[PDB]
Amino acid sequence: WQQVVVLRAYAKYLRQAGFPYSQSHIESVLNENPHTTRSLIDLFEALFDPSQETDGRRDAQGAAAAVAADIDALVSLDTDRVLRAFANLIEATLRTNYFVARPDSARARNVLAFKLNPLVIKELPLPRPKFEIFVYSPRVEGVHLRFGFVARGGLRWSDRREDFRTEILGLVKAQAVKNAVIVPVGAKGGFVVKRPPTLTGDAAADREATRAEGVECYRLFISGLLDVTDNVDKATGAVVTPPEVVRRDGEDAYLVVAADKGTATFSDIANEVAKSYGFWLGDAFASGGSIGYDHKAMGITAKGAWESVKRHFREMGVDTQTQDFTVVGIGDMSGDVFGNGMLLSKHIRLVAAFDHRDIFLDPNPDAGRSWDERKRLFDLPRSSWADYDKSLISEGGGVYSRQQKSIPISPQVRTALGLDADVEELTPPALIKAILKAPVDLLWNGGIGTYIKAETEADADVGDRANDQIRVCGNQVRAKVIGEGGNLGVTALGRIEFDLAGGRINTDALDNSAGVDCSDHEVNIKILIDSAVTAGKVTPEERTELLLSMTDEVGELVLADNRDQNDLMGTSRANAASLLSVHARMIKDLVDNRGLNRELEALPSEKEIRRRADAGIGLTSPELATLMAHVKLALKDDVLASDLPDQEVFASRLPYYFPTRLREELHGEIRSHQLRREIITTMLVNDLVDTAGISYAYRITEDVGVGPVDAVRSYVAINAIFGIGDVWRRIRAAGDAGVPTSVTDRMTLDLRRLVDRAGRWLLNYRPQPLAVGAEINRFGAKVAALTPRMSEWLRGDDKAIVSKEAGDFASHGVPEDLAYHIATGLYQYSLLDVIDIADIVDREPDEVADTYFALMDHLGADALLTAVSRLSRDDRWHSLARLAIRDDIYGSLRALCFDVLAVGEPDENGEEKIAEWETTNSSRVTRARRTLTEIYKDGEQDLATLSVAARQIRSMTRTS
Amino acid sequence: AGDFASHGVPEDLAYHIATGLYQYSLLDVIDIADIVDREPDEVADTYFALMDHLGADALLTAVSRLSRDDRWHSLARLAIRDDIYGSLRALCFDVLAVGEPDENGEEKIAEWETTNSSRVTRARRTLTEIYKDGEQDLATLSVAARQIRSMTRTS
């Protein structure tokens, strides 16, 4: 009967996979072929019986040949397909718990677990996860999908026992995007009970049976998960395989369970089960529950969404910390998101805020009194809007109940809500709909469900009946800024329509990621301290004290990460219109190679892209966030396959992930972290995308023609040489002082132009692969020495345009030193060629830079470079051509620098060197200079004129 | 030559006419032989063999198809033409810098391609993809011109 259970579980998995024939057809086929079923049973048993490993070589060829020689003899198409599916399932099986016999395991409790490789199963619909775990039992049935070795995700207590794997596979994509900024990879699991709770007709007894039966099934599902999962033992530091378990894949020990719609209160139960199994993660197996961080006291999710709200308001020119603004909210002063988000600013004027029970209306709210009352309400352990003080409410406003038939409308409420002038009373449904469509500065979301829909989206496809009566249209919402503190507040198409309606909006996974990030960081810390617990460095009863001590620093680190991502999104929004073609090329590349689905990820189609191109508009902000997340995931996958995290020059920033206390006290444990490579990869990709931009690596791939690994090397070299991170931080700090977002965005765009050109220079002028440490140590010191003295050698038009740009920057509040440093970025790029030239001519870089920039002013190369920058980039080939002519000009000036410094004496300045070089030229050089002069006089700046000018500069050099 | 002779043109005159664009390259061949103080026979052999190796004839024909409606486009098209010719001159210097005179053009090209680098490999792949694309505007020909240029160290 046990082997029958194995076959039954495989058949149930096939039904979950969407196999056409039903269970009755499957069992009929198996019954009509008992010899074949015997062959498959022998195959599975011999593969996974540990005793077979003690019986010499396993009967691999014999079992495989017997099965094949029986399958090919079949004549029935349905029988052949069914038995082939089972044969492939047996071949794809990696681990099982059929032979473990320890009493505490789930096997003794009649639970069967299978670890499967979905990549080699024919009947599985796309996408195919990296690892799958199928747990079958007569009481509970669950699945778990993972896309990588280090994975994280929640567990649904689903009720769709007929086909729940489709629901899990649908949610795994959104979960994968949700984990773009955090270390692990998106994963998703889900279990369902098979016998429903006892139907007795009494609500008190029914709801008790649902919870009671759910815990026992939840315990069993996790127990099956831990049977096949490996364990990490710090007695030796290696990964141990559970006994009586025969593996066919490699090693896999990471497994983290997150709360979800049916697991929010099951965290402590999961941790207790992990303790029973003796799992290495311990209390980190589940997020929070009873040991961890008070997310209510932290409010990290509300702060994370408030960063996006503040960025949008700064883009509007409004400071939420010093200017009063009106807010419509969803929720009450009792939840984590809404409660912490409504107390972050004393200038908040909550005009209206509905909930699941009652509605709060304030036509002309105050600031200090409103903040005080909101704080007082948040002080209670539990409260609603009915507890709001009716003495502090404005005239005409108040608190009403959602269960009333109708609510009278005051003229003040109507004036503060922007409704039809003839209304005098309204119903709670229409009141909520009118609140959702209001001329209000901020729309704070802290509730559950979807309240905003797209115009073309169907009500049933949303998947929320409770809000089906109150769902509104995205293009109809009148709010300027929408902050999504909760999950799934607005659909992706609704986000696209809202951003196309002029409103500012980002993806929810970009706003509320802080709560996930703080969940990841704590886990990433809980492991490290646990290591120090085994080493004796951490006293066991001081461990919890240490976590409670580092809570604020953890929140600060997560907030810094969210600030970085928000700043990158703002800059990308500023440069969204001019990079539409490159974005479309990136989408096509990801679709062709990484198997991205445009409709599933809400990315625009080719027709939509060309329609926007004819309309002169780039991608929407949520679309940009989605593409940025996918690029981050692809870069993570590329780096993990490489050895960059292994090398020290990239691993030098590992301690910065952890708080300062751990940074000082724990050094060897940090250097010997279990998830070190993944943390390094996440940090590198986050820094690269945040600083260089979304399209940095892809443009490198098209232009240079190398893999993303070399792009990462180039960005690291440039960041260490020029200090791009410090400049970006200074720009952000200046923007925080009162500088408008336009000036800061332009500064970041110029800096990104600098890093693009410089990285291309390293990829084109240095041996491949790039020795990052070598080029850093041979360029960075000289660049840092020559950068401050830039004013010593700029002449003529170069000095004039730099002074103009620096003055324009400083006129908006930018510091003069930062403004001048920004205006010289294109000239700081030339210092790389200056250092290379000085290395070749074994001379000091001061004279080399002097003569180089003097010669640049002599030929007026700045005007030609600016004209080259104006060249069209509508297709790829024109882009390659314009970078070609740019690099040709730069190389020509390099050769001219060789020619000029080949004569003269070092004490001579740039002007004298140019004079004596022009003295000994020929009619060829005279004709070339006259041609450039006539070209400048003509004023034509098409490709042909710039090209002939490029050879004129080339012809000035003998080596050409 | 066959098309010319099909109308009554003598075969010798027809072949001499059809080789005019290649008789032009003999000036560069003689200059190269003068620089490398070698016989012009081997120089011409390797030069035209390298021309067939890179398919410079197709690029020159495409350059000849460029528009001449104004003066500047004419200067640009003569610029790209002379750039291609000078690049093949430099490649001839590089190829004849190694090997032995008894080796023919094919062997010299083979041993030159043997000791190249990833830069030259990328350039040749780029020209191959350019030929596969079939686009013959100014931009594509210009980037192809640097690909041929990038095959040379002195560039």
Residue numbers in the entry:
A (entry chain B): 629 to 1588
B (entry chain C): 1434 to 1588
The authors write:
Glutamate dehydrogenases (GDHs) are ubiquitous oligomeric enzymes that catalyze the reversible oxidative deamination of l-glutamate to 2-oxoglutarate, at the crossroad between the Krebs cycle and ammonium assimilation. Large glutamate dehydrogenases composed of 180 kDa subunits (L-GDHs180) contain long N- and C-terminal segments flanking the catalytic core. Here we show that the mycobacterial L-GDH180 (mL-GDH180) adopts a quaternary structure that is radically different from that of related low molecular weight enzymes. Intersubunit contacts in mL-GDH180 involve a C-terminal domain that we propose as a new fold and a flexible N-terminal segment comprising ACT-like and PAS-type domains that could act as metabolic sensors for allosteric regulation.
Cryo-EM and SAXS data uncovered the intrinsic flexibility of native mL-GDH180. In contrast, 2D averages for side views of mL-GDH180 tetramers revealed a high degree of flexibility at distal ends, where ACT*1-2 and PAS domains reside, and their corresponding densities vanished in 3D cryo-EM maps. A 3D-classification of the detected mL-GDH180 particles was performed to distinguish alternate conformers of the enzyme. Two mL-GDH180 conformers were found, called the open and closed conformations, for which the ACT*3 module, the HM3, the catalytic domain and the C-terminal region were defined in each monomer, achieving an estimated 3.59 Å resolution for this region in the open conformation. The two conformers differ in the relative positions of the centers of mass of the subunits. The catalytic domains in mL-GDH180 monomers in contact through their N-terminal segments are found closer to each other in the less stable closed conformation compared to the open form. A comparison of the mL-GDH180 conformers identified by cryo-EM shows that conformational changes in the N-terminal region correlate with alterations in the relative positions of the catalytic domains. The catalytic domains in the mL-GDH180 complex were not found to contribute intersubunit contacts. Instead, the N- and C-terminal regions of mL-GDH180 provide dimer-like interactions between pairs of monomers.
